[PDB]
Design a protein around this nucleic acid. Structure first.
Ligand SMILES: [Mg+2]
Ligand SMILES: [Mg+2]
Ligand SMILES: [Mg+2]
Ligand SMILES: [Mg+2]
Ligand SMILES: [Mg+2]
Ligand SMILES: [Mg+2]
Ligand SMILES: [Mg+2]
Ligand SMILES: [Mg+2]
Ligand SMILES: [Mg+2]
Ligand SMILES: [Mg+2]
Ligand SMILES: [Mg+2]
Ligand SMILES: [Mg+2]
Ligand SMILES: [Mg+2]
Ligand SMILES: [Mg+2]
Ligand SMILES: [Mg+2]
Ligand SMILES: [Mg+2]
Ligand SMILES: [Mg+2]
Ligand SMILES: [Mg+2]
Ligand SMILES: [Mg+2]
Ligand SMILES: [Mg+2]
Ligand SMILES: [Mg+2]
Ligand SMILES: [Mg+2]
Lengths: 102, 90, 54, 62, 117, 70
RNA sequence: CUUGAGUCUCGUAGAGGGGGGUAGAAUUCCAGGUGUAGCGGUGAAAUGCGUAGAGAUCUGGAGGAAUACCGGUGGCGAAGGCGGCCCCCUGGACGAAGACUGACGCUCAGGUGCGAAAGCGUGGGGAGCAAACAGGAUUAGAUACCCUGGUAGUCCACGCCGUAAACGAUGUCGACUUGGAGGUUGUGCCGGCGUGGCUUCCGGAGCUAACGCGUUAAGUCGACCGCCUGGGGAGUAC
């Protein structure tokens, strides 16, 4: 329906669970005739400043083209899941595919 | 656009040049051969009589002078030249 | 009383005093570049000292 | 300038954005960096987004 | 008693006074002096000289402990905002590091009203 | 404005670096400013004065060169 | 009938409005550790805070309010006004070629709606600030200015009030009349040359009692509305 771009970071010690999380989310997305246009994964990077006294986090870029309700579910999912320590959901004007500078 | 990014080129405080002055102020002179790039050298410098020297007096326009770099302010984008140093230490 | 004081020194102390009292350079009353240099010279020395005064 | 025909300065271009902040993370004004009006506004949004994600700092004192 | 070697010297330069305190590098106070305690009052209390005394009379409050290193950490706009950094030198420490940590709100709270006089 | 001291660097070269560190970070300006609350009308009225002055500091550099003393 | 007015197609810039999330800096508090005699404040002082351990310094927690830098004689809005970041709903403007309607327009007494700050009602909230109030100073006196505290209020929801130097002290719409330097936002054709919108400063003719205004007119005209008729008494009394 409409494009986005997620960029969720996740608690370092629990990086093992990230491939699962990516697996899960990209199911819900496309499980409503969505799409994936990009899905890089930056992996244990250094935080410019602390976050709940952490000095590292596992980052996961991801683009989408979904309708609103699924991209909405997804945001709530991030809220309650407490391994996900930051979220971010920009809109974008088009699909974005080309690989990121990370 | 380009030159300011890779200003390592003449970064070291010890580095010295011969640049050419554009205009004078009464607090400095500006010595600009590097092109798209330009220093100052403050009136404090240029002499060993501190300010007992008008920039007009020691130097005049379109005049090449030997100078060391002292301070480059990568951002704020301003280089601090020195003219009293590249000549004598009385 | 018999002879006028050094014009350069006076010009340098007038500069200092406008400095400390916080007037703008470009109040300088001299165009004689010689006296002008003294005036600003004072005015900039004074700019340093204001900082450490209250 | 960021006028190598750029459409929309990007926040994750951390290499580039670093040229437009200072040591203490403060954004550098257009007049210093020669940036055009509407590239400065993009440059602001990007650095602000970045700061959220902790790809760039707000300060030195933290 | 327990010697240290590596310390840090916080300096609180207000317009009216200058507090200086040496601490261990986990910020545990060891000694301190002020201009007010140095023996200056009012007009005098608020000078770079009175701040100097403070710094050096705080230096010979921490002889008990080791010395050599000292990273200075200055805060506020007072006149005591260097005369101290100077004094600690001739007190005989080596200043490895030195930084302004003056707090600034990124907006924050409404300041008091302006003084009419 | 966080200067670490360099190998064999004199103290009175670190100090002057440190001073120039916060001159260019404009600290005392920021603190001086926020000692007291300025009404938003006053701040905005200051901003015009700055402008109508700056402007007339792009006039002397022209006009003087046109006129002449003695 | 297509030149005024409008509709559609593709894009652009924007603190325009409404709702909901969230992030860093800082202040105040609460709980700990370190540590010891002063802190705070002023022109100078004192009230105040502190050996029941303050101030300073480090760690943890709570809570509200505002959004440094970017930031500019920048931008948006009918005006009042609007400034972190992110999604949801939503208004207006502007341009490029095309197509479409065919004078459908301009103005507007009464009417209707929006309308800063203070203030009022009900229910929340309360860090900082601060009318009232209290104490300390100053002074011949000081119901003030200055200092120490500090309650309404400032914040949120809904409802009232309808006012401001609500100002460009300049009603709205259209036409015409030498120039110069900028700012911001589109688009043509070759980093030069054009063509649109909005805007800042300067000045020519003209106009003006003068100051000044000057293609964003206070110039030259047309359409409609609002308003003035010596000063007090009075924007008051009934
Ligand atoms: Mg005060
Ligand atoms: Mg804390
Ligand atoms: Mg027809
Ligand atoms: Mg009416
Ligand atoms: Mg009405
Ligand atoms: Mg109100
Ligand atoms: Mg009442
Ligand atoms: Mg109320
Ligand atoms: Mg209440
Ligand atoms: Mg108070
Ligand atoms: Mg009061
Ligand atoms: Mg009283
Ligand atoms: Mg609401
Ligand atoms: Mg209301
Ligand atoms: Mg009225
Ligand atoms: Mg009126
Ligand atoms: Mg007209
Ligand atoms: Mg004019
Ligand atoms: Mg007219
Ligand atoms: Mg008239
Ligand atoms: Mg009357
Ligand atoms: Mg009445």
């Amino acid at each position: 329906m409409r494009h986005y771009e997620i960029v969720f970071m996740v608690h370092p010690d629990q990086s093992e669970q990230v491939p699962g999380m990516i697996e899960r989310y990209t199911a819900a997305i496309t499980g409503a005739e969505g799409k994936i246009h990009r899905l890089e994964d930056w992996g244990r990077r250094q935080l410019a400043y602390p976050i709940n006294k952490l000095h590292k986090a596992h980052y996961v870029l991801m683009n989408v083209e979904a309708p609103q309700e699924v991209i909405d579910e997804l945001e709530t999912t991030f809220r309650f899941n407490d391994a996900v320590i930051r979220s971010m959901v920009m809109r974008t004007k088009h699909a974005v595919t080309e690989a990121s500078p990370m | 656009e380009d030159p300011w990014v890779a200003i390592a080129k003449r970064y070291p405080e010890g580095t010295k040049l011969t640049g050419r002055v554009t205009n004078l102020t009464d607090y400095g002179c500006f010595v600009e051969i590097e092109e798209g790039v330009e220093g100052l050298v403050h009136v404090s410098e240029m002499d060993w009589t501190n300010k007992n020297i008008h920039p007009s007096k020691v130097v005049n326009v379109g005049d090449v002078v030997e100078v060391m770099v002292l301070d480059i302010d990568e951002e704020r984008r301003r280089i601090s030249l020195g003219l009293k140093q590249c000549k004598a230490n009385p | 009383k018999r002879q006028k004081r050094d014009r350069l020194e006076r010009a340098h102390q007038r500069g200092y005093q406008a400095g400390i009292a916080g007037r703008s350079k470009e109040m300088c009353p001299y165009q004689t570049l010689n006296q002008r240099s003294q005036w600003l010279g004072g005015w900039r020395e004074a700019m340093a000292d204001r900082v450490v005064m209250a | 300038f960021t006028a190598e025909g750029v459409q929309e300065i990007d926040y994750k271009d951390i290499a580039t954005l670093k040229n437009y902040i200072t040591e203490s993370g403060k954004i550098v004004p257009s007049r210093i960096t020669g940036t055009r009006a509407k590239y400065q506004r993009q440059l602001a949004r990007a650095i602000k987004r970045a700061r959220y994600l902790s790809l760039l700092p707000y300060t030195d004192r933290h | 008693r327990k010697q240290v070697s590596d310390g840090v010297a916080h300096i609180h330069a207000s317009f009216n006074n200058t507090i200086v305190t040496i601490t261990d590098r986990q910020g545990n106070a060891l000694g301190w002096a002020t201009a007010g305690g140095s023996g200056f009052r009012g007009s005098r209390k608020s000078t770079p000289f009175a701040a100097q005394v403070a710094a050096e009379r705080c230096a010979d409050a921490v002889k008990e402990y080791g010395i050599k290193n000292l990273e200075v950490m200055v805060k506020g706009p007072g006149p005591g905002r260097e005369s101290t950094i100077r004094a600690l030198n001739a007190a005989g420490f080596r200043i490895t590091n030195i930084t302004d940590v003056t707090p600034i709100p990124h907006x924050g709270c409404r300041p008091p009203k302006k003084r009419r006089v | 404005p966080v200067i670490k001291v360099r190998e064999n660097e004199p103290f009175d070269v670190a100090l002057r670096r440190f001073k120039r560190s916060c001159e260019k970070a404009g600290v005392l300006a920021e603190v001086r400013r926020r000692e007291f609350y300025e009404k938003p009308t006053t701040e905005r009225k200051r901003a015009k004065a700055s402008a109508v002055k700056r402007h007339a500091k792009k006039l002397a550099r022209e006009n003087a060169r046109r006129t002449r003393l003695y």
